[PDB]
Design a protein around this ligand. Structure first.
Ligand SMILES: *[C@@H]1O[C@H](CO)[C@@H](O)[C@H](O)[C@H]1NC(C)=O
Ligand SMILES: *[C@@H]1O[C@H](CO)[C@@H](O)[C@H](O)[C@H]1NC(C)=O
Ligand SMILES: *[C@@H]1O[C@H](CO)[C@@H](O)[C@H](O)[C@H]1NC(C)=O
Ligand SMILES: *[C@@H]1O[C@H](CO)[C@@H](O)[C@H](O)[C@H]1NC(C)=O
Ligand SMILES: *[C@@H]1O[C@H](CO)[C@@H](O)[C@H](O)[C@H]1NC(C)=O
Lengths: 224, 108, 120
């Protein structure tokens, strides 16, 4: 499939001080403005030189894994996807397309939702790896209200080993700038990109456009 | 079952009202919708939920439900477009979705 | 934006049976309901049957029940319907309609097909 969703719009890159969590970037994936119909989508690829610091905040999560590689085409690439029940980490010779995303849709006679991964990749020829364990992310808590929870990660690739880190802490101040796991013996990495989750329905009539939609999402990035 | 006066007529630029009627169970405890039938072509939805137009082409229309009677109309009619119109909904008692007989709009 | 296309015209002799096929594009059949409607020449529309979101089944009109049958296949993404015991007065155009798949009990048919004609 691989429908096209990108939009001509571009915005000047914002930046903020790290404040000892620097010249950290700041991106907006789904952006809304006064003109209520302005839904925009853009997930550019970013360099991966030595290491990356990742953080985000979400009301109801739409963030599922990442993709890493050098060519990002059928000509290898590490892929991660995480869902509500279990995480899966796989190394495979995937064939991606310009606008990868994870789609979900209704199932009329089974009274449940289902997720289709074929919107991300087309071919997985002669492919081996697979892993399973408890999920990295989680979207439930014993409290709901004004305060939110903040996530963070660190990736480094030294001596051939691949390693991950993560911590969870809630905020106590009003909304502002940032307050102030496994080891996989996997490849040459120089780029990566995050992938979102989108959902569709048919309740409304005469929707002469693509039905993919979701809420607003943002995240931070930095280098070592 | 339902009834509807056939073959209404009007002059261009004037108001026009179309009346569709039913019983307590046929049209009472449900919504309605209105379709038009250009000759030699499949119908095309126009109104749903008794007052809501779909996005895009549909022009401004209205509908009120006086218990078991509903009406549709347009402030001004034109010869640019004109065809048959139909009413129909889901009967709630010992019946399924049914359609009315239709009325052949006439423009001088 | 769903676009529907179906088989071409058909002819038949008295007493036989015929099948009509309707296809979809864009969306997939597993998240849409299907309905069938017929109109005699100049006599107005008439409802044949369809899928009821209230429960998982297929219900037919009270008048014609037993004379028809419906089936679906998702691999090719095409819906099927059959008609039998054709008689003298049976002749009309046949339309393939779709609508909301998960409303409690709602009726807003859209869109429709280009139409097929069956002679008897
Ligand atoms: C999406 O845009 C790219 C731009 O290079 C184009 O090659 C591709 O054909 C487009 N997708 C479709 C479905 O046309
Ligand atoms: C880093 O600081 C420079 C200072 O001139 C600024 O131009 C640049 O935009 C900053 N980085 C980002 C990602 O904005
Ligand atoms: C989540 O991912 C696992 C990994 O294999 C898969 O088995 C499962 O079907 C996916 N979906 C749900 C709802 O668990
Ligand atoms: C149907 O739903 C049940 C639970 O409601 C689930 O266990 C089963 O896997 C579903 N089957 C299909 C084919 O979706
Ligand atoms: C795996 O490689 C072999 C080469 O011997 C080839 O025959 C086979 O089709 C490949 N499998 C896939 C899924 O591409």
């Amino acid at each position: 499939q691989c429908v096209n969703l990108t939009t001509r719009t571009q915005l000047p890159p914002a930046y903020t001080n790290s404040f000892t969590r620097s010249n950290v970037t700041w991106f907006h994936a789904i952006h809304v403005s006064g003109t209520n119909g302005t839904k925009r989508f853009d997930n550019p690829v970013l360099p991966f030189n030595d290491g990356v610091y990742f953080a985000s905040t979400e009301k109801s999560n739409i963030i599922r894994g990442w993709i890493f590689g050098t060519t990002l085409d059928s000509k290898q690439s590490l892929l991660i996807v995480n869902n509500a029940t279990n995480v899966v980490i796989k190394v495979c010779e995937f064939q991606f397309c310009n606008d990868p995303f994870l789609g979900v849709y209704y199932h009329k006679n089974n009274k449940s939702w289902m997720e289709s991964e074929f919107r991300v990749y087309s071919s997985a020829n002669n492919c081996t790896f697979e892993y399973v364990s408890q999920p990295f992310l989680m979207d439930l808590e014993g409290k709901q209200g004004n305060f939110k929870n903040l996530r963070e990660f660190v990736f480094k690739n030294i001596d051939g080993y691949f390693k991950i880190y993560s911590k969870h802490t809630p905020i106590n101040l009003v909304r502002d700038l940032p307050q102030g796991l496994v080891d996989l013996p996997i490849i040459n990495i120089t780029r990566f990109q995050t992938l979102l989750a989108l959902h569709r329905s048919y309740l409304t009539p005469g929707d002469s456009s693509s039905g993919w939609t979701a809420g607003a999402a943002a995240y931070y990035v930095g280098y070592l | 079952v339902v009834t509807q006066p056939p073959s209404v007529s009007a002059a261009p630029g004037q108001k026009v009202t179309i009346s569709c009627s039913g019983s307590s169970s046929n049209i009472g405890n449900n919504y309605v919708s209105w379709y038009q039938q250009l000759p030699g072509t499949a119908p095309k939805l126009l109104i749903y939920d008794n007052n809501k137009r779909p996005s895009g082409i549909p022009d401004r229309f209205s509908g009120s439900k006086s218990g078991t009677s509903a009406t549709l109309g347009i402030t001004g009619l034109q010869t640019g477009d004109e065809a048959d119109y139909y009413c129909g909904t889901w009967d709630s008692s010992l019946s399924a979705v049914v359609f009315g007989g239709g009325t052949k709009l006439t423009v001088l | 934006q769903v676009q529907l296309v179906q088989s071409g015209a058909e002819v038949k002799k008295p007493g036989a049976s015929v099948k009509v096929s309707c296809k979809v594009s864009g969306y997939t059949l597993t998240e849409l309901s299907m309905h069938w409607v017929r109109q005699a020449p100049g006599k107005g529309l008439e409802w044949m049957g369809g899928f009821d979101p209230e429960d998982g089944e297929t219900i037919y009109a009270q008048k014609f029940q037993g004379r028809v049958t419906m089936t679906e296949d998702t691999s090719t993404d095409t819906a099927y319907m059959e008609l039998s015991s054709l008689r003298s007065e049976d002749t009309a155009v046949y339309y393939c309609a779709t609508g909301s798949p998960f409303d409690r009990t709602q009726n807003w048919f859209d869109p429709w097909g280009q139409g097929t004609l069956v002679t008897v």
